UniProtKB/Swiss-Prot annotation, chain A:
Ubiquitinated by the DCX(AMBRA1) complex, leading to its degradation by the proteasome. Overexpressed in prostate cancer cell line PC-3 and breast cancer cell line SK-BR-3. It comes from the Eukaryota. This is Elongin-C. It comes from Homo sapiens (Human). Belongs to the SKP1 family. CDD domains: BTB_POZ_EloC. GO terms for biological process: protein ubiquitination; regulation of transcription by RNA polymerase II; target-directed miRNA degradation; transcription initiation at RNA polymerase II promoter; ubiquitin-dependent protein catabolic process. One of its GO terms (cellular component) is cytosol. Pathway: Protein modification; protein ubiquitination.
Curated annotation (Swiss-Prot), chain B:
The lineage of its organism: Eukaryota, Metazoa, Chordata, Craniata, Vertebrata. Heterotrimer of an A (ELOA, ELOA2 or ELOA3P), ELOB and ELOC subunit. The elongin BC complex interacts with EPOP; leading to recruit the elongin BC complex to Polycomb group (PcG) target genes, thereby restricting excessive activity of the PRC2/EED-EZH2 complex. (Microbial infection) Following infection by HIV-1 virus, component of a cullin-5-RING E3 ubiquitin-protein ligase complex (ECS complex) hijacked by the HIV-1 Vif protein. The modification N-acetylmethionine is found at residue 1. Pathway: Protein modification; protein ubiquitination. PROSITE patterns: UBIQUITIN_2. The gene is ELOB. This is Elongin-B. It comes from Homo sapiens (Human).
From Swiss-Prot, chain C:
Changing residue 45 to P: In VHLD; type I. Disulfide bonds: none annotated. Changing residue 14 to G: In VHLD; type I-II. Changing residue 101 to G: In VHLD; type II. Changing residue 59 to L: In PCC and VHLD; type II. It comes from Homo sapiens. Changing residue 110 to G: In VHLD; type I. The gene is VHL. Changing residue 68 to F: In VHLD; type II. Pathway: Protein modification; protein ubiquitination. Changing residue 71 to T: In VHLD; type I. Residues 97-106 are annotated as: Interaction with Elongin BC complex. Changing residue 18 to T: In VHLD; type I. Changing residue 55 to R: In VHLD; type II. This is von Hippel-Lindau disease tumor suppressor. The chain holds residues 61 to 213 of 213 of the full protein.
């Protein structure tokens, strides 16, 4: 399918493009249409999806790349989510 | 040229991109493919402001300086239950814990 | 000193344009291969600098030594000024991994003495203490140049 569904621990459902989700090696292996993350919260998984669009947009770019912002409060949880997802 | 969106309704949130010159109607089309709902049965908002299908996303206020990949713009979504369209409802995200004492 | 600047004494006028949100620390590799730090470029600025053909430059974040790109590559080598045309060195942020990006934010917030107080996996503790290092990167690039000097390619 063109899109995939990632579900947070608190129930939120994020529909993202399949190619974008493949940015995560873990998700790329989990798919073998929906993926349920019992440990990643909505305020974390929304930033992960934002990183996917960011990565796909700028990875092969000759132009200047903007900073990926990360608020101090989400840094520790995002780090653990990123560590698990291999992002 | 590309605008980055987060189409949101209930606890559902769609991450997609489109051109600044693309129309509100074409966005409803992308939603139809995903949530299986015809454009006529959906309403798209921008901070409680109903959007016209003939308008471009650019005209609606979605620009490269507002709909960035790292900070996508939010588009409200409302479906059609019976004769009346449901009220716009966007479930907020969870709140991060207290900032660690070491930070 | 396999990864070093060639001593040609031929001037090459370069322009260091910092197109990144970071304070950049340009690093010239001397004739003995030692990293030599030059004046820092503020976020957004650019300066016309005098270098030479064959010299080796590398750019990092001035405060954390995070790796940066120069014309998409890791190393910049000033070439011959075709009819006096200044050579452009565009310094940009790479697309860091989300994990690396989080490690940068955490390091910038927590003192190294307090990494062990964070409630994270033992493996992430190691990744935090494994700060970006210029000598380490140089040992890498040197070993890569040595590998190309041994393999056909």
């Amino acid at each position: 399918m063109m899109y995939v569904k990632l579900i947070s621990s608190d129930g939120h459902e994020f529909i993202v493009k399949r190619e974008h989700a493949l940015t995560s090696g873990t998700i790329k292996a989990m798919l073998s249409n929906e993926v349920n993350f019992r440990e990643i919260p909505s305020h974390v998984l929304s930033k992960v999806c934002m990183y996917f669009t960011y990565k796909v947009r700028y990875t092969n770019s000759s132009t200047e790349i903007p900073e990926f912002p990360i608020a101090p409060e989400i840094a520790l949880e995002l780090l653990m989510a990123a560590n698990f997802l291999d992002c | 040229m590309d605008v980055f969106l987060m189409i949101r309704r209930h606890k559902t949130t769609i991450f997609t991109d489109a051109k600044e010159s693309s129309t509100v109607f074409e966005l409803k089309r992308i939603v139809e493919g995903i949530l299986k709902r015809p454009p006529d049965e959906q309403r798209l908002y921008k901070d409680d402001q109903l959007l016209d299908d003939g308008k471009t996303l650019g005209e609606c206020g979605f620009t490269s300086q507002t709909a960035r990949p790292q900070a996508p713009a939010t588009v409200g979504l409302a479906f059609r239950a019976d004769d009346t369209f449901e009220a716009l409802c966007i479930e907020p995200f969870s709140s991060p814990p207290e900032l660690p004492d070491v930070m | 000193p396999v990864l070093r600047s060639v001593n040609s004494r031929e001037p090459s006028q370069v322009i260091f344009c910092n197109r990144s949100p970071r304070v950049v620390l340009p690093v010239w590799l001397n004739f003995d291969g030692e990293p030599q730090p030059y004046p820092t470029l503020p976020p957004g600025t650019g300066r016309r600098i005098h270098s030479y053909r064959g010299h080796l430059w590398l750019f990092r974040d001035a405060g954390t030594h995070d790796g940066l790109l120069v014309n998409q590559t890791e190393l910049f080598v000033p070439s011959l000024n075709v009819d006096g045309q200044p050579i452009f060195a565009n310094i940009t942020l790479p697309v860091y991994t989300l994990k690396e990006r989080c490690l940068q934010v955490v390091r910038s917030l927590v003192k190294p003495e307090n990494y062990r107080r964070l409630d994270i996996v033992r493996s992430l503790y190691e990744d935090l203490e494994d700060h970006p290092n210029v000598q380490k990167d140089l040992e890498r690039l040197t070993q890569e140049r040595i590998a190309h000097q041994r393999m056909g390619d």
